From a paper:
Herein, we have chosen to use an extracellular dye-type heme peroxidase found in Streptomyces lividans and referred to as DtpAa. The overall structure reveals a ferredoxin-like fold typical of dye decolourizing peroxidases with two DtpAa monomers in the crystallographic asymmetric unit. Heme enzymes catalyse many essential reactions in biology and understanding their structures throughout their reaction cycles is of high interest, prompting extensive efforts made to obtain ‘intact’ structures at high resolution. A major challenge is to obtain the higher valence states of these proteins, for example peroxidases (FeIII resting state and FeIV intermediate states), as these states are phenomenally sensitive to reduction in synchrotron experiments caused by the presence of large numbers of solvated electrons or other radiolytically produced species, generated by the interaction of X-rays with the crystal.
Serial synchrotron crystallography was carried out at Diamond Light Source beamline I24 at an X-ray energy of 12.8 keV using the same chip and translation system as used for SFX at SACLA. Following each translation of the chip to bring a fresh aperture/crystal into the beam, a series of 10 ms exposures were recorded using the PILATUS3 detector in shutterless mode. We first describe an MSS experiment series comprising five dose points with a dose increment of 32.8 kGy (MSS1). The initial resolution was 1.78 Å with only a limited loss of diffracting power/resolution during the 50 ms of total exposure for each microcrystal. Dataset 1 of this series (MSS1-ds1, 32.8 kGy) reveals a six-coordinate heme with a slightly lengthened Fe—O bond at 2.48 Å compared with the SFX structure [Fig. 2(b)]. Notably, the iron—water bond in MSS1-ds1, the shortest out of all the SSX structures, is elongated compared with the SFX structure.
Author numbering:
A (entry chain A): 55 to 416
B (entry chain B): 56 to 416
């Protein structure tokens, strides 16, 4: 229930241990005034400092003037910080505004079309995003709600996604969570303690070509539906062949323990692990940080289920893009469909109490 | 960490309220009574496993490679998490299987209420399973696997996820707050109050339906909050709507949350004043609802509210009179009922040989 420090060279919520809940919101900007947008970013940073410490925004949730609406909507009163992190990102469409055209990073690449894509344009894209993660879903909603409230008239929520449970791990010393297909998900990721691998694969560097992005990262979000009726009638052997690890232990095929290293030549040539492994992609390595979702029924008598896939990387062109291209023949494709997509440049961290979100860009 | 599955009553009504909810309504697609009874027994066997934290059937792995696993496996490694599974039967079930003359009179159809805006697709249902647990993945796994076991005899009609408190960080003493920011649950029937449960919650033999003795009647309402409107109201407007202050949740004029309210100090259309048993001839409800937030709608608004659940001994003397009295509730400006269902919740599964619905079938 403790707090995660908000200030740093990097934004929290990436290398941070993965919290239980997610509320992800994408915003479009509705103001033409650069000064007004900068004032928004400063007000948002002040609110974030309160929220991530477990305090109410502004002058608080009650005890103010009777005739005024309260500064804070109040539904997190008496709750702990709950490891809340707030991570902001900037979408490519943002750079068509405020004269930012020449500051768009080369590494913030539009994704190509992939075979099987069925992207809903209403739940894709966005000028910016806020990723709220916490162990308490009410804490995460309270944070998104109050940020959107503060931004009234300057931003509007384009789409959002709640994740009821994590399907990722940055802490390999703790139990790996399972996704809704029943497999452990997160075994071979990047750990928050692997500072060298984060430098190599996650954090943007000044020499990469965009100095305002130094210390930041790039985010790919993909909303993926799971065909669970189809999956649930597949044999156990079929399911394990699809991934290349057994279902119970999560060990690489042939081996006894989850964390034993995969021997890829023993997996089917279209096994998901074989195709996604860095060794199959010229070393390309991602930080996966996704969550499971379910949004009711599908209207056809079935549960709706999916995975909200989030990947952080130093350069979209050398992280997600090569790996996802290599998944064109993935055996998993029979059981999933990508139905939403968005990319964002995640700026560097808020260095101290005088700093603010996006200050290196604006 | 676990709640016993067997008893005179079904768990999940008077037992401690867990952090998360997955509520599912099912429709029945078989006409064959024997097929439906077979499913009730199979579901009961699965519920026994699930509430003890075990996988269904012969498990999630280790079986024949050429067969699908009995359990879909996403709760492997998790704890029981105080999972309870509570089954209920909808009025529409009684048009099947020759049961028409066995519908309880206390299982009444609800009247239309001023301001109803019910989505038919998220209303009704032949039966329900309320899955409550501290870990939402444990709850989802239970619904997912019951639906799979039932495939061919039942389909899922609608499903709702909900959250209350997070107990690993919030004292069990503390009243949870709803998404309007007010403490919610202060004056409620507690599961410790065995006499009030007998008077207001559990169906009795003399009530007129012997197979329902020890059961209860459930009203479910999906209530949307108009969040962005509410958040633009003044603090005084918000407190006037309920009759309690927002910080402490004390009734107007008193100092502490648990002070008994003085109804005449509240505005005449204040929510607490209209809902109170003294304004409804003594009618008293067990509320066991959960908050929800499903995302944002096409206009950018928060799709959020209260998945209201009330248990009572008779729908005609519980939910209906109180909801009728809310016709003029000041809160009506900020909420809209968009989904509705009622269920007869049978008595408990008495031992390892008993099964869900045995007193009815
Ligand atoms: C519903 C969609 C997906 C499911 C169910 C899924 C499932 C899994 C599972 C069970 C593992 C093995 C355990 C682990 O090391 O994490 C894994 C590994 C991995 N997956 Fe996926 N995955 C999905 C989508 C994706 C996508 C879209 C990508 C990238 C575009 C991806 C990239 C990876 C990578 C890089 C690994 C680690 C491979 C290694 O280094 O051993 N996954 N996935
Ligand atoms: C979004 C919808 C609703 C909200 C936000 C809400 C909120 C509240 C709040 C804040 C209280 C005061 C604290 C407490 O004793 O729990 C309360 C009391 C109560 N509410 Fe509501 N309520 C809602 C809908 C309903 C409905 C539909 C009913 C019944 C049909 C109902 C019946 C009651 C009752 C019986 C009390 C106890 C009053 C007393 O005896 O003092 N509520 N509610």
């Amino acid at each position: 229930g403790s707090a995660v420090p908000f200030h740093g060279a990097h934004q929290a919520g990436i290398a941070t241990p993965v919290q239980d809940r997610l509320h992800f919101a994408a915003f479009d900007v509705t103001t033409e005034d650069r000064a007004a947008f900068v004032a928004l970013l400063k007000e948002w940073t002040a609110a974030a400092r309160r929220l991530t410490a477990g305090h109410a925004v502004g002058e608080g949730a009650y005890g103010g003037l009777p005739e005024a609406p309260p500064d804070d909507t109040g539904e997190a009163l008496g709750l702990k910080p709950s490891r809340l992190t707030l991570t902001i990102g900037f979408g490519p469409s943002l750079f068509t505004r405020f004269g930012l055209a020449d500051l768009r990073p080369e590494a913030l690449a539009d994704l190509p079309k992939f075979p099987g894509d069925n992207l809903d344009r209403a739940r894709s894209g966005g000028d910016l995003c806020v990723q709220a993660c916490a162990d308490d879903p009410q804490v995460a909603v309270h944070a998104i709600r109050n940020l959107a409230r503060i931004g009234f008239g300057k931003v509007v929520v384009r789409w959002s996604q709640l994740g009821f449970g994590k399907t990722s791990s940055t802490t390999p010393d703790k139990q790996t969570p399972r996704n809704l297909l029943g497999f452990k998900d997160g075994t071979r990721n990047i750990a928050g303690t692997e500072k060298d691998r984060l430098d190599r694969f996650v954090w943007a560097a000044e020499k990469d070509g965009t100095p305002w992005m130094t210390g930041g990262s790039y985010l790919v979000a993909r909303r993926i539906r799971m065909h669970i009726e189809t999956w649930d009638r597949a044999s156990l052997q079929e399911q394990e062949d699809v991934f290349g690890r057994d279902k119970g232990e999560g060990a690489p095929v042939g081996k006894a323990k989850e964390r034993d290293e995969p021997f890829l030549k023993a997996m089917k040539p279209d096994a998901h692990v074989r195709l996604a492994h860095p060794d199959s992609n010229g070393g390309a390595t991602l930080l996966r940080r996704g969550y499971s979702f379910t949004d009711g029924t599908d209207g056809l008598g079935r549960l709706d289920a999916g995975l909200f896939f989030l990947a952080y990387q130093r350069d979209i062109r050398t992280g997600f893009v090569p790996v996802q291209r290599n998944l064109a023949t993935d055996a998993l494709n029979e059981y999933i469909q990508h139905v939403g997509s968005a990319v964002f440049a995640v700026p560097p961290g808020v260095r101290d109490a005088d700093d603010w979100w996006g200050s290196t860009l604006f």
